[PDB]
Structures are given as C-alpha cells and as structure tokens.
Design a protein around this nucleic acid. Structure first.
Ligand SMILES: [Mg+2]
Ligand SMILES: [Mg+2]
Ligand SMILES: [Mg+2]
Ligand SMILES: [Mg+2]
Ligand SMILES: [Mg+2]
Ligand SMILES: [Mg+2]
Ligand SMILES: [Mg+2]
Ligand SMILES: [Mg+2]
Ligand SMILES: [Mg+2]
Ligand SMILES: [Mg+2]
Ligand SMILES: [Mg+2]
Ligand SMILES: [Mg+2]
Ligand SMILES: [Mg+2]
Ligand SMILES: [Mg+2]
Ligand SMILES: [Mg+2]
Ligand SMILES: [Mg+2]
Ligand SMILES: [Mg+2]
Ligand SMILES: [Mg+2]
Ligand SMILES: [Mg+2]
Ligand SMILES: [Mg+2]
Ligand SMILES: [Mg+2]
Ligand SMILES: [Mg+2]
Ligand SMILES: [Mg+2]
Ligand SMILES: [Mg+2]
Ligand SMILES: [Mg+2]
Ligand SMILES: [Mg+2]
Ligand SMILES: [Mg+2]
Ligand SMILES: [Mg+2]
Ligand SMILES: [Mg+2]
Ligand SMILES: [Mg+2]
Ligand SMILES: [Mg+2]
Ligand SMILES: [Mg+2]
Ligand SMILES: [Mg+2]
Ligand SMILES: [Mg+2]
Ligand SMILES: [Mg+2]
Ligand SMILES: [Mg+2]
Ligand SMILES: [Mg+2]
Ligand SMILES: [Mg+2]
Ligand SMILES: [Mg+2]
Ligand SMILES: [Mg+2]
Ligand SMILES: [Mg+2]
Ligand SMILES: [Mg+2]
Ligand SMILES: [Mg+2]
Ligand SMILES: [Mg+2]
Ligand SMILES: [Mg+2]
Ligand SMILES: [Mg+2]
Ligand SMILES: [Mg+2]
Ligand SMILES: [Mg+2]
Ligand SMILES: [Mg+2]
Ligand SMILES: [Mg+2]
Ligand SMILES: [Mg+2]
Ligand SMILES: [Mg+2]
Ligand SMILES: [Mg+2]
Ligand SMILES: [Mg+2]
Ligand SMILES: [Mg+2]
Ligand SMILES: [Mg+2]
Ligand SMILES: [Mg+2]
Ligand SMILES: [Mg+2]
Ligand SMILES: [Mg+2]
Ligand SMILES: [Mg+2]
Ligand SMILES: [Mg+2]
Ligand SMILES: [Mg+2]
Ligand SMILES: [Mg+2]
Ligand SMILES: [Mg+2]
Ligand SMILES: [Mg+2]
Ligand SMILES: [Mg+2]
Ligand SMILES: [Mg+2]
Ligand SMILES: [Mg+2]
Ligand SMILES: [Mg+2]
Ligand SMILES: [Mg+2]
Ligand SMILES: [Mg+2]
Ligand SMILES: [Mg+2]
Ligand SMILES: [Mg+2]
Ligand SMILES: [Mg+2]
Ligand SMILES: [Mg+2]
Ligand SMILES: [Mg+2]
Ligand SMILES: [Mg+2]
Ligand SMILES: [Mg+2]
Ligand SMILES: [Mg+2]
Ligand SMILES: [Mg+2]
Ligand SMILES: [Mg+2]
Ligand SMILES: [Mg+2]
Ligand SMILES: [Mg+2]
Ligand SMILES: [Mg+2]
Ligand SMILES: [Mg+2]
Ligand SMILES: [Mg+2]
Ligand SMILES: [Mg+2]
Ligand SMILES: [Mg+2]
Ligand SMILES: [Mg+2]
Ligand SMILES: [Mg+2]
Ligand SMILES: [Mg+2]
Ligand SMILES: [Mg+2]
Ligand SMILES: [Mg+2]
Ligand SMILES: [Mg+2]
Ligand SMILES: [Mg+2]
Ligand SMILES: [Mg+2]
Ligand SMILES: [Mg+2]
Ligand SMILES: [Mg+2]
Ligand SMILES: [Mg+2]
Ligand SMILES: [Mg+2]
Ligand SMILES: [Mg+2]
Ligand SMILES: [Mg+2]
Ligand SMILES: [Mg+2]
Ligand SMILES: [Mg+2]
Ligand SMILES: [Mg+2]
Ligand SMILES: [Mg+2]
Ligand SMILES: [Mg+2]
Ligand SMILES: [Mg+2]
Ligand SMILES: [Mg+2]
Ligand SMILES: [Mg+2]
Ligand SMILES: [Mg+2]
Ligand SMILES: [Mg+2]
Ligand SMILES: [Mg+2]
Ligand SMILES: [Mg+2]
Ligand SMILES: [Mg+2]
Ligand SMILES: [Mg+2]
Ligand SMILES: [Mg+2]
Ligand SMILES: [Mg+2]
Ligand SMILES: [Mg+2]
Ligand SMILES: [Mg+2]
Lengths: 137, 204, 159
RNA sequence: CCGAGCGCGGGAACAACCGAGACCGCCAGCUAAGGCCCCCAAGUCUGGGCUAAGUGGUAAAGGAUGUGGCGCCGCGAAGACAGCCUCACUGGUCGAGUGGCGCCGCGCCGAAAAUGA
RNA sequence: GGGGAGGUUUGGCACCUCGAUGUCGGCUCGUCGCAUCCUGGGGCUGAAGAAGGUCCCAAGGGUUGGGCUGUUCGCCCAUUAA
RNA sequence: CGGAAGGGAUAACCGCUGAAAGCAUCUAAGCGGGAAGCCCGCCCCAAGAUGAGGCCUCCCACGGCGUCAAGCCGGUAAGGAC
C-alpha cells in the first residue's frame, strides 16, 4: 500500500527574477508551488515550497509583447471589459505580470488557491528576511 | 488645499450692487486641528479638523486621550481635510477671501424608497388611453433569451438621496468672521442644520 | 575622423570635441574598432539585419564627430509681407499672421541666431536636434501652397 | 460507423473524426490514437533548417525592394552601379559588383458586427 | 467581366419547439455594432478664400417638434451641429 | 453648479536623424508632433481588497478546571447592547 507522508516542513525558496523569461520562469515556480519535485508528492495536501521572487519588475519577455499582448479584466457592468497592455502593467504594480502567470498555471481548485498564497512576489530586491533565503535559479 | 467643517444654516438672497443674489449661509465655526497625517507614519498628508464643542459627557471614551494628546477642547465632530496643512492651532473662515470659489460637500436629503419616476425621472405610462396599472412603472427591463438577464446597474426604484453629494465651484459671496459665517451661491446639499465641508475648488 | 575623442562603451560610443560631447547609442552587436586616428565599424555576418545596422552606426558615429568638431546648423527663410523674424536674447520670436507672435525658446544645446528678419541660424552639435528644431519652426507656418508665404528652408517654393 | 458501442482513450467540450469491440477482480506490465512547458501523465531530448507575423491561432481574386533557397539572361577593373545636376561614360572616385526576369519555402496586405474577452 | 465580406432584406432546407416559443405598429426601458448622420483629427482636390467633394482615423457624447396613414416606411411643414 | 483646464500614451496623418540600397526613404535601430477617442485628472461607491489594509487614543493578566495541546466555566476592564 502506497506511502503517505505526514506533517513536514515547507522549504522556503528565493528566486531572482530579473533576466528570466516570463512564462519560462512561471512554469518552474508553479512546479515548486506544488510538491511535484519532492518524491513524497501528494496531490491533495499542499506541500510545495514557499517560493519568493524579487526584482520581478525586471522580467524579460520576447517578441513585441510589452507593446502588444494585453490583459483583460471584466467588471459585471456593460462595457465593463477593461484592457491593459503588458507595458502599463509593469509601469504600475509589476509583480502582477508574474503572478498572473503563475496563478494561471496552478490547478483551479480550492487547493490551487492555498498554493497561490505560498507564492510571494516582490518588485525587489529585498523582502521579509524571515528564515530561509535559499538562492535558486 | 484649503478646507473647513461647518453647518448649513440656511439661505437668503442679498444685493451685490444693483443685482439680486441667492446666497446660502454656512457656519464655518472655529476648527481646532486635532491631528496631522504625514507620509512619515500615515502615507499621505492631511489635517484632522475638529468642530463643535462637546461636554465631557459622552467623551468618557478613549477620545479624551486623542484630545489631550493634542491638548484641545473635546469637539463633537472631526473630519480630515486632505492635503491641507495650516499651522498647529486653528482654522477659521479667514481662509476664504470673498471672490474665491469653493467646492462644498454635504449629504443630500433622504427620499427614502423612491420610485423610478422620481429617482431616475423615467417617463412611465400615460395617465390615460389604457393600461391604468402602470402609470408610474419602468416598463421593460430587458430583451429575450439573449442575454436572458437584466443589466448590472439597471436604473430601478430604490433608496434616493441621503448620500454624499458635492456641488462645485460655488462663489464665496461674503465672509463675516465676527459671527463665523460664510456666504456662497446658495446651492449647497443637505438640510439646514446639516453638517458640510467647504474647500478650495478646481478650475485653474 | 580627426579630432575624435571617441570611447567605446558596453553598447554606446562617446565622441567629444571643442564644441561638446555626445553619446551615440550603437547596437552592442557591432565591432566599433577605434583606430589610432580613424574609427571603423565592423559587422558580424553578411546578414540582412546587420547590413542595415552597420551603415547606420557607421554614420551616427561620424555624425557625432563632425558635430563636436564642426557642428550642424540649419537655415530658415521667412517669406510673405507681414511675416518677419526677430531674436529675443536667445529665444526666437516671430510674427507670421496669427493674432499672436509665436515665442519659441531653444531646447538645451540648441542655439539659433537672427542675422536678419528673414533668416534663422538654428545651430547645435547634434544633427537630430537641428533637423528637428529646424522643421519645428517651419511647422509654425508651413509654406503657402497658393502664394509664397511662411517659413522655408533654402530649397525652391511650391506655388 | 452510430442506430444497438451517449461503455473506454484522443479530438478543449461534441451519436457516427482518430484508437479500440468493456464476463468480473488487481495500489501489475506493454502499446494504440494523441501527446511528452505549467494547468495534466510523459524530453523545456539530440542534430539541421525556416518563420518575426502572435503568422502559428484556421478566407479569396489580386497587389508589394518582406525574407531565405534555386536558375537563366544582359553590363564591368578596356573602371563598370549609385551619387557626385545626373543615368551612358572617361580623367573623377568609392573603384567591384550591378541591373532584368523566372521557380520554390515561410510570411505581408487584401481582412468591418453586434452581452466580455 | 473577376474575387469577397456581412447575416439587416427576398428566398432555399425542414434540425429544436404542435401535452402551445403570443404574431404587426406604438409606448416604456434601453444596451451593443461601426460599414460615422453631427461634433473631433487628418490625406487629396478640378483646395484663392468661404464652402464643398472624396478617402482615412475616430463611439465620447449627441442625433427636435408636428401634418397624413394602424402603419414600419415614406411624403410634407418648421427647425437642426446632425 | 457640472461637461473642463491640465499631465501621459496614442490612431489616421505630419516630421527628424537614417541605413539595408555610395542616391533616396518617417523606419528596419532610434527621436519629435498628433484626436470630442485611450490612461489619469473631476464626482461617487469601496478592506468579505478571506490579499479582510493603515493611523491616533483606551482597556489588560487567571478566578476554578484541561497533567499534553486546542478548550470549558463564573465576575470584570475599555466599551458595547437592551
Ligand atoms: Mg517542468
Ligand atoms: Mg493572467
Ligand atoms: Mg489538482
Ligand atoms: Mg476544470
Ligand atoms: Mg475560481
Ligand atoms: Mg432656507
Ligand atoms: Mg504616528
Ligand atoms: Mg494612516
Ligand atoms: Mg453619541
Ligand atoms: Mg416610479
Ligand atoms: Mg431627479
Ligand atoms: Mg419626475
Ligand atoms: Mg421627467
Ligand atoms: Mg385596457
Ligand atoms: Mg417577455
Ligand atoms: Mg445568456
Ligand atoms: Mg438611502
Ligand atoms: Mg456628489
Ligand atoms: Mg429651516
Ligand atoms: Mg435648523
Ligand atoms: Mg490659400
Ligand atoms: Mg455495431
Ligand atoms: Mg457518455
Ligand atoms: Mg446518459
Ligand atoms: Mg473526449
Ligand atoms: Mg469519445
Ligand atoms: Mg452513440
Ligand atoms: Mg461514438
Ligand atoms: Mg473493448
Ligand atoms: Mg461475469
Ligand atoms: Mg480482466
Ligand atoms: Mg495490490
Ligand atoms: Mg506489445
Ligand atoms: Mg512492445
Ligand atoms: Mg516535459
Ligand atoms: Mg486550468
Ligand atoms: Mg509534467
Ligand atoms: Mg523542447
Ligand atoms: Mg532545433
Ligand atoms: Mg498583423
Ligand atoms: Mg469568413
Ligand atoms: Mg491570410
Ligand atoms: Mg473563399
Ligand atoms: Mg477562388
Ligand atoms: Mg490561394
Ligand atoms: Mg494568396
Ligand atoms: Mg507582379
Ligand atoms: Mg513583414
Ligand atoms: Mg531570393
Ligand atoms: Mg548601363
Ligand atoms: Mg560618350
Ligand atoms: Mg575609383
Ligand atoms: Mg530583360
Ligand atoms: Mg521556371
Ligand atoms: Mg491585418
Ligand atoms: Mg474598426
Ligand atoms: Mg468582435
Ligand atoms: Mg457585370
Ligand atoms: Mg460591371
Ligand atoms: Mg459572377
Ligand atoms: Mg439572420
Ligand atoms: Mg414575395
Ligand atoms: Mg433566411
Ligand atoms: Mg423538423
Ligand atoms: Mg429529411
Ligand atoms: Mg408549436
Ligand atoms: Mg408555456
Ligand atoms: Mg403569427
Ligand atoms: Mg397578428
Ligand atoms: Mg430614454
Ligand atoms: Mg456603446
Ligand atoms: Mg462589446
Ligand atoms: Mg471635423
Ligand atoms: Mg478634408
Ligand atoms: Mg494629386
Ligand atoms: Mg484662382
Ligand atoms: Mg474657390
Ligand atoms: Mg449611437
Ligand atoms: Mg415628432
Ligand atoms: Mg401620427
Ligand atoms: Mg411600405
Ligand atoms: Mg426604407
Ligand atoms: Mg407607405
Ligand atoms: Mg421615397
Ligand atoms: Mg442649421
Ligand atoms: Mg442641413
Ligand atoms: Mg454643420
Ligand atoms: Mg449651464
Ligand atoms: Mg487630453
Ligand atoms: Mg510631464
Ligand atoms: Mg509628450
Ligand atoms: Mg493608451
Ligand atoms: Mg508607448
Ligand atoms: Mg527626415
Ligand atoms: Mg522605428
Ligand atoms: Mg527589410
Ligand atoms: Mg517615439
Ligand atoms: Mg516628448
Ligand atoms: Mg510624441
Ligand atoms: Mg492635431
Ligand atoms: Mg486627444
Ligand atoms: Mg477638448
Ligand atoms: Mg469640450
Ligand atoms: Mg481608440
Ligand atoms: Mg472604509
Ligand atoms: Mg476591516
Ligand atoms: Mg480597518
Ligand atoms: Mg480609562
Ligand atoms: Mg487583553
Ligand atoms: Mg495593564
Ligand atoms: Mg496585565
Ligand atoms: Mg493581578
Ligand atoms: Mg486587573
Ligand atoms: Mg504545541
Ligand atoms: Mg450569569
Ligand atoms: Mg463578564
Ligand atoms: Mg481601568
Ligand atoms: Mg463607558
Ligand atoms: Mg444591537
Ligand atoms: Mg444603546
């Protein structure tokens, strides 16, 4: 009968964002958010590392993107569809662009959100120097 | 950004040279600056004005401390004029030379549950020629199977007035520091005895 | 390329001279060999992209050089009856028909003179500045296409 | 083939399209179609090209010094192609490439819709 | 003569609905589309100017009151930036 | 009394510098200007922004149980409700 892990401790990680290609980084970030790298992986628990990102304001992204490529929010009201280009996202709160990527990469369930909270993204550098600052690339 | 609390006292016309003028009196009252906000430990600049004397009855609260910490007569009301920054003491009608124009924020009278006719000035049915049981109704509120729902924010009967309203760019017709009064172009929201806040406008 | 005070950077040449200094943004992917007295522009590959960038930077650097040494300056010609130029300390002011005389101050680095109420010595070190501010004046009142009025350069009219 | 296989895998979802005919059980193994960056199992695999349009992510006649590949035909160090009013051409001079056509791959324009993408 | 776009018209097909999906016009309330009527910005003009013509960009807002007819539409009166 | 003024980024379009292509070219690198439209600005809602934010001031021990940990039960405090 297959092994079930018990209450273990979350491994807090720290990733430097600047230079990294947006989507490419998000993918790995997501994987870390779930277990999926720890061989005691369990799909219904929440055991992914606490990823911390810094210098997110400096994420690289190929092609025209920034100019083109737009994020759309929808208010409930008529015409309530807002459209905001990648450019202006970074202009203001930029950690958004990475978050909206990692979030869209997490499973959509009630667990998915638990995990989305373990992801801490900052304009960086610097952040809550709690405990582990295990540089990672 | 100038500013000051006060009460709508009422209104009555006067005579600028030979020319009638509608005017509403506001009791600017003396306002003791109770506290200052600042980016230092507030993230923004603003002055918390006090207004109207409050006897130590209901002041039993921890307000006594917020009051003593600035050492000021305990007031009955206190709001923040944002981005205003005068001088550790008091602001009065002296802030407003006649001719300046001021925005004025008050709370509209309360219509309670108002029909679509009064709330939104809908047309409603005809008093005659048929229907009869729809004289003041809104009529249609949608389409058919598509969208198959009513639009969010559809004008419908509900509570009217009794809300934060701000008429703008009113002319300060006159000011009488002797009685702490202030005269403007009359059109200020809320009922007499209603509290209100005057301040500098936007125009240039 | 004499009088050159060039200096290669991680991605931008910097020429200097008696007249001033100008930073010339050149694509990093180009060899900007600075010879003892004659800078060269080398291009990796015979590709299409690189050709264009070569000839371009090849000129921008030369343009900065001739700038900090000789300098650039455009010549604007006023026309039409009422129309007339006139300097004011350092800012140019001109009447051209509108109910108000146009007051155009010079942007930093730019300097225009008025040798006559019919000419404008727009002068500076950077070619961009000049070429711009030049046309920026001609814009204040482009050439009349039906007569012979308004600002002009030094080339034939329209009529 | 569905009907009677709206039982199973793929095609986002979808009777008849691709795989395949479910007697029951198994916390075993191998493959099919389709896939192997994350949502989601499996290579961000190896070697070589093409594309710069989000093309890919789904439209035509037709149009264009987009971009690579191929071929033939005209001028030229007897100095050629541009601009030095010039094209031709000699002294000029960068001087060694240049002009025309045709075939292929990928792209570009042509390309306007009604609740929010 | 040739190629398309749209799904407002006129049609074709007979797939849902016949143990029921109320049909025209008006009123009330609108919202969306843009292939734009007006206002805004532009290119060209056979653009002197004033005014037009045509194409381009552009929904933000606006887009009148009556006569005849059930009419939609249309015609007409008086206006309009329309 | 309101539509704004103003700042920013732009569409068509107008340019600067400028090759690929010794010329030329607003463009391929790069820069300027440019709409009642876009983002701000104005007014209103707004921390169930479960990502539940901030600031000022006020009150503060345990009284018997739970041997562990989360809790239970009487009187209170600031203060709140009837
Ligand atoms: Mg992975
Ligand atoms: Mg997103
Ligand atoms: Mg899951
Ligand atoms: Mg799902
Ligand atoms: Mg959800
Ligand atoms: Mg009264
Ligand atoms: Mg403080
Ligand atoms: Mg604060
Ligand atoms: Mg009270
Ligand atoms: Mg009503
Ligand atoms: Mg009303
Ligand atoms: Mg009414
Ligand atoms: Mg009415
Ligand atoms: Mg009846
Ligand atoms: Mg109905
Ligand atoms: Mg629906
Ligand atoms: Mg109410
Ligand atoms: Mg209001
Ligand atoms: Mg009264
Ligand atoms: Mg009263
Ligand atoms: Mg003319
Ligand atoms: Mg069968
Ligand atoms: Mg089934
Ligand atoms: Mg079934
Ligand atoms: Mg399937
Ligand atoms: Mg199937
Ligand atoms: Mg079937
Ligand atoms: Mg089947
Ligand atoms: Mg079978
Ligand atoms: Mg059996
Ligand atoms: Mg079996
Ligand atoms: Mg077993
Ligand atoms: Mg086998
Ligand atoms: Mg096998
Ligand atoms: Mg993989
Ligand atoms: Mg998903
Ligand atoms: Mg995987
Ligand atoms: Mg790969
Ligand atoms: Mg490869
Ligand atoms: Mg395109
Ligand atoms: Mg089509
Ligand atoms: Mg196509
Ligand atoms: Mg076709
Ligand atoms: Mg065809
Ligand atoms: Mg074809
Ligand atoms: Mg074709
Ligand atoms: Mg052809
Ligand atoms: Mg192209
Ligand atoms: Mg070729
Ligand atoms: Mg020849
Ligand atoms: Mg000859
Ligand atoms: Mg030669
Ligand atoms: Mg030939
Ligand atoms: Mg052939
Ligand atoms: Mg297109
Ligand atoms: Mg369009
Ligand atoms: Mg659409
Ligand atoms: Mg015909
Ligand atoms: Mg014909
Ligand atoms: Mg035909
Ligand atoms: Mg139809
Ligand atoms: Mg018929
Ligand atoms: Mg039909
Ligand atoms: Mg049928
Ligand atoms: Mg049949
Ligand atoms: Mg029926
Ligand atoms: Mg029924
Ligand atoms: Mg019928
Ligand atoms: Mg009928
Ligand atoms: Mg209406
Ligand atoms: Mg609309
Ligand atoms: Mg829409
Ligand atoms: Mg116009
Ligand atoms: Mg025109
Ligand atoms: Mg012409
Ligand atoms: Mg004439
Ligand atoms: Mg004329
Ligand atoms: Mg409309
Ligand atoms: Mg009418
Ligand atoms: Mg009638
Ligand atoms: Mg008819
Ligand atoms: Mg008709
Ligand atoms: Mg008719
Ligand atoms: Mg007719
Ligand atoms: Mg008119
Ligand atoms: Mg007319
Ligand atoms: Mg008009
Ligand atoms: Mg008015
Ligand atoms: Mg603006
Ligand atoms: Mg600025
Ligand atoms: Mg600007
Ligand atoms: Mg914008
Ligand atoms: Mg931009
Ligand atoms: Mg130019
Ligand atoms: Mg460019
Ligand atoms: Mg090219
Ligand atoms: Mg630019
Ligand atoms: Mg600028
Ligand atoms: Mg600009
Ligand atoms: Mg303009
Ligand atoms: Mg504009
Ligand atoms: Mg305007
Ligand atoms: Mg206006
Ligand atoms: Mg727009
Ligand atoms: Mg609040
Ligand atoms: Mg709260
Ligand atoms: Mg709070
Ligand atoms: Mg106390
Ligand atoms: Mg306590
Ligand atoms: Mg204590
Ligand atoms: Mg204590
Ligand atoms: Mg004690
Ligand atoms: Mg105590
Ligand atoms: Mg413990
Ligand atoms: Mg009790
Ligand atoms: Mg108690
Ligand atoms: Mg006490
Ligand atoms: Mg008390
Ligand atoms: Mg209560
Ligand atoms: Mg009470």
């Amino acid at each position: 009968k297959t092994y079930v892990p018990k209450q273990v401790e979350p491994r807090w990680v720290l990733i430097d964002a600047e230079g990294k290609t947006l989507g490419r980084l998000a993918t790995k970030i997501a994987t870390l958010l779930r277990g999926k790298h720890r061989p005691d992986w369990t799909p219904n628990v929440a055991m992914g590392d606490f990823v911390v990102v810094v210098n997110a304001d400096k994420i690289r992204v190929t092609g025209k993107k920034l100019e083109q490529k737009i994020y759309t929010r929808y208010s409930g009201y008529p015409g309530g569809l807002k459209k905001i280009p990648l450019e202006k996202m970074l202009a203001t709160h930029p950690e958004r662009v990475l978050e909206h990527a990692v979030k869209g990469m997490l499973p959509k369930g009630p667990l998915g959100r638990r995990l989305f909270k373990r992801l801490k993204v900052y304009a960086g550098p610097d952040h809550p120097h709690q405990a582990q600052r295990p540089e990672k690339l | 950004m100038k500013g000051i609390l006060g009460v709508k006292v009422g209104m009555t016309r006067i005579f600028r040279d030979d020319r009638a003028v509608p005017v509403t009196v506001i009791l600017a009252g003396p306002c003791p600056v109770v506290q200052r906000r600042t980016p230092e430990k507030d993230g923004y600049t603003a002055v918390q004005l006090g207004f109207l004397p409050q006897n130590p009855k209901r002041v039993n609260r921890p307000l006594k401390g917020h009051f003593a910490k600035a050492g000021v007569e305990p007031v009955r009301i206190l709001r923040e004029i944002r981005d205003f920054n005068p001088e550790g003491d008091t602001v009065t009608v002296e802030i407003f030379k006649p001719g300046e124009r001021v925005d004025v924020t008050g709370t509209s009278k309360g219509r309670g549950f108002a029909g679509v006719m009064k709330r939104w000035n809908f047309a409603g049915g005809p008093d005659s020629h048929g229907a009869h049981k729809i004289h003041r109704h809104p009529g249609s509120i949608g389409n058919r199977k598509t969208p198959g729902r009513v639009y969010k924010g559809k004008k419908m009967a509900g509570h009217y007035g009794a809300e934060r309203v701000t008429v703008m760019n009113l002319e300060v017709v006159d000011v009488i520091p002797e009685e702490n009064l202030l005269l403007v172009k009359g059109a200020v929201p809320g009922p007499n005895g209603g509290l209100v806040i005057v301040r500098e406008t936007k125009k240039a | 390329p004499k009088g050159v005070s060039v200096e290669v950077a991680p991605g931008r040449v910097k020429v200097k001279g008696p007249k001033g200094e100008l930073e010339v943004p050149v694509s990093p992917e180009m060899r900007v060999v600075v010879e003892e007295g004659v800078v060269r522009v080398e291009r990796p590959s015979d590709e299409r992209r690189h050709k264009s960038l070569h000839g371009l930077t090849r000129t921008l650097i030369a343009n900065a050089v001739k700038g900090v040494s000789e300098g650039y300056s455009k010549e604007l010609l006023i026309k039409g009856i009422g129309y007339r130029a006139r300097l004011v300390g350092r800012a140019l002011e001109l009447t051209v028909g509108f109910s108000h005389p146009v007051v155009v101050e010079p942007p930093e680095g730019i300097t225009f003179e008025v040798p006559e109420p019919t000419r404008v010595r727009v002068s500076g070190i950077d070619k961009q500045k000049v070429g711009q501010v030049a046309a920026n004046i001609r814009a204040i009142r482009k050439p009349s296409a039906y007569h012979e009025k308004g600002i002009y350069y030094a080339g034939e009219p329209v009529r």
